[PDB]
Amino acid sequence: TCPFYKKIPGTGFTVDAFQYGVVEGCTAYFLTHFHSDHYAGLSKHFTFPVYCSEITGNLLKNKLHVQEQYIHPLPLDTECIVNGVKVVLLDANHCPGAVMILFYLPNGTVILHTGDFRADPSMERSLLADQKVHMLYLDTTYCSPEYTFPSQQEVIRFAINTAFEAVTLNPHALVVCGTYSIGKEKVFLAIADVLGSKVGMSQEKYKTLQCLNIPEINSLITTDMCSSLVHLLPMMQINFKGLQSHLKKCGGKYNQILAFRPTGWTHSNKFTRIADVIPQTKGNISIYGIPYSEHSSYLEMKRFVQWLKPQKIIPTVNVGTWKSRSTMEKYFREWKLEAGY
Template identity: 50%
Template sequence: MDEEDFEYIPLMKKKKKNLVTEDKKKKEENTKKLSRNQKRDKNKAQNKVESTPSKSQGTTRQKRKTPKSKTPKRERKKYDGYCPACQMPFSALVIETPTWHASECIDNYKPESECSEGADCDCTIQSHFWRFSHKQLAEYRQRKTRADQIGSRTNKGSKDKTNTNTSNNNIPNSSNNSLSIKSKLNGAIPSQLSSTESCDNVVREKNLNEVLMNSMKKSASEPCIDLGATSKDFKSALVKNATDILMSSVNSKHVKEKESLPRTRKIITKDDKELQNVLGIENSGKGNQSTKPVRNCPFYKKIPETGFTVDAFCYGNVPGCKAYFLSHFHYDHYRGLTKKFSSPIYCSKVTGNLIKSRIGINPDIVHDLPMNTPCTVEGTEVLLLEANHCPGSVLFLFKTQQGRLILHTGDFRADPSMEEMKCLQNVRIHQLYLDTTYCDPKYAFPPQKLVIEFGVSLVDKIMTEKPKTLVVCGSYTIGKERIFTAIARRFDCKICVQRDKYKVLECLEDPDLSARLTLDANETFLHVLPMGKLNLQGLHEHRSKLRTDYNNVVAIEPTGWTYNDKMVSLDQIKPKGNKEIKIYGLPYSEHSSYLELKRFIQYIRPDQILPTVNNGNPATRRKMESIFESWMTEDKAENKPKQTKIGAWAK
């Protein structure tokens, strides 16, 4: 027998022994598992028996292991109370705060009709309250709050007597007058207080009668006042005071929300006095006291030596102003003008039609001045010139009694045709109020006529390739009319506008344009929509409302802000959108470009230039001053004054 066989046999015996031990271990583990499972089943059965409630014992709720909860989502903040103007519950607000919503309602709330549900209206949709008024609901809530107040007073009992005894120490002892006041408090509340009382949850702890009583407790020396029929004026003033107190209590609960509202103008620091003069802001606070800035009319809105202001309606009654001039009907220029305005307004015929029809200004105070015809206003000669901006926009050329010429451009698009105006030839312009919207070298967009011709040719090319195309032009309330009128003349078609735009265009008194207007969207392929609807969703919704089946939609967005300084030719314009809807942004502007401003100033060559746009930043003002000086010196004209600093104008 070899050595290899002798070594092999013992190895086999060892492996057999190992296999036997492994089998035993597996059997033991299986028995242990079975015993564990049996115990587990018994425990489950016992738990079920114990968890079932018996008739004698109360129900015991089985405790469950709560799984690890994820981070809870932030819930939307819900507000209590109702809007004082539209009666909408504040709980329906999603983004706005109650203070924000109430301020918007006070300014813009114009319901169409009364809600048919009356006092039973329980709607929580915001658009419903914007569309319908809820006077009956406000009266119902008013009566309810009064009843709650009376019930709360009667339930107090003896506590009220002790409180009244202590409070009467500050009031003169006059039982008859005090009784007359208490008996007539409920009658002293007019219907207009329903808006404030509707916020019952917000000012729940405020008692209207207590507020009225406290408002009369000014001093112990004053006699007690009877709210009889002979003192109606005082009663109304007293109720107004109580209303202010109630509204202040509502606003005090939303101080943090009020601070988060956007501010229209920043508070100016003390170091920048020049900027305060430019913006027309004076801080009435002393020391480090934080007071609201008082907005006075800035100097660049005033015409010196005349007592006139231009586009200064948001500053209230300007001291010393004899006449208010309006350059055109754009909101940033007529802001603050309401139908209650009573001072004389001077403007063009078209602008006068717009403010009378759109705002409801009293026609007696609107004075329409003719174009290119000198007129005398308060001893000053005024001449209106075409501004090439929007319909009705004008330049004001003032000639003071001292013989100084002052030119105010308002908003304008400088054009070489202005150099042919005889009133601007061979004259010395002492002061120029200049529209500097695009006073930056990067805004060198092409002339207006080239952009209009490109827009017409673009539509012509698309219509020849795809006849079933809907053409949409963007527009403001007034402005951008030259684009869609040029397209309408090329195709000799109608122009579909919305009813609001139709009323605006009627004020232009243009017979050719009026003959092309229509409200029927299915009568023409050329439509005019607001700029805000020139997006994929807005254009898709507009097309879906039409009976005519259009395969494609082409929208033209005419604005100078679409201009890119890398653009060399208009042919480089590429649309945005998809295969069916394409939006072309044309660099069409109704403000002067950088090069057009340069040519205009080098032609006018005024003694002083004052920018009326983007003049709030000191760095921007210094940049514009250097630009003006470079333009004036570039022509190398002799004996011409240099541009002075803008801050010197305010001194």
């Protein structure tokens, strides 16, 4: 049964609610982004209207085989009427195709559902500038002050310089980047661009990347592994055993691996600056964990909320324990007292 924080009151709508069977009264199912916890339940047998971005729609059709007649893509930054209700989709700054949804309810209430997002000051100059929001359904993944991490630009600068140094010292080194979902593509694209290489990968991952509307993608990726010195591998293979096994398959072309594991936050963020990050090393294999986040830091989240000044906040992450719910409620009240709304 569908929980309350996935329903939009006063409408026939749900958000990211495909794992509950047929939801009573639902006339349109919104999907914020193509991550498995959110799409859980969709397939070729789904026969209700799905509303989403263009990119999410390409993934639903090609990867999950949802039939074309049930996929309803909407453009971004554009007022659209769905089942008699005005909606807008906004870029969430999460993975490719990810959106926030603004709903203009028939009674005058305005609701923003962030989906998953990485708040940014640029959002203060979207269509959100123009009006009041009564209810915010908020991605609270990192809603605690211990959650700190650098900008995505700093993290990419670190990865490019690390890869470029290693391969210039040793032309026979291979770079490997872990993946398990869409998102974080800048990590492997930036490294391959500095090395003058295409990115090599499986047929299955190539298919996924071909759905993402990335400009000039045919120039950047390939399924011919032997032609490439940046390889993508499943995240589970990014360990000394998996990497050893991969280096055997390359036919004595390479004699060293440098690997990257993009994570979210880890507690080594509580002590170490990005610049000071060191790898784990066994023999001719080195593995870097890099804190490339596609969710708001505490401070980015707080800035956004204090600017938007919502009347009520409904968290969508960390909702399962009393201690988490209490902690989030305390911070929301501080933020409101501090800013005066």
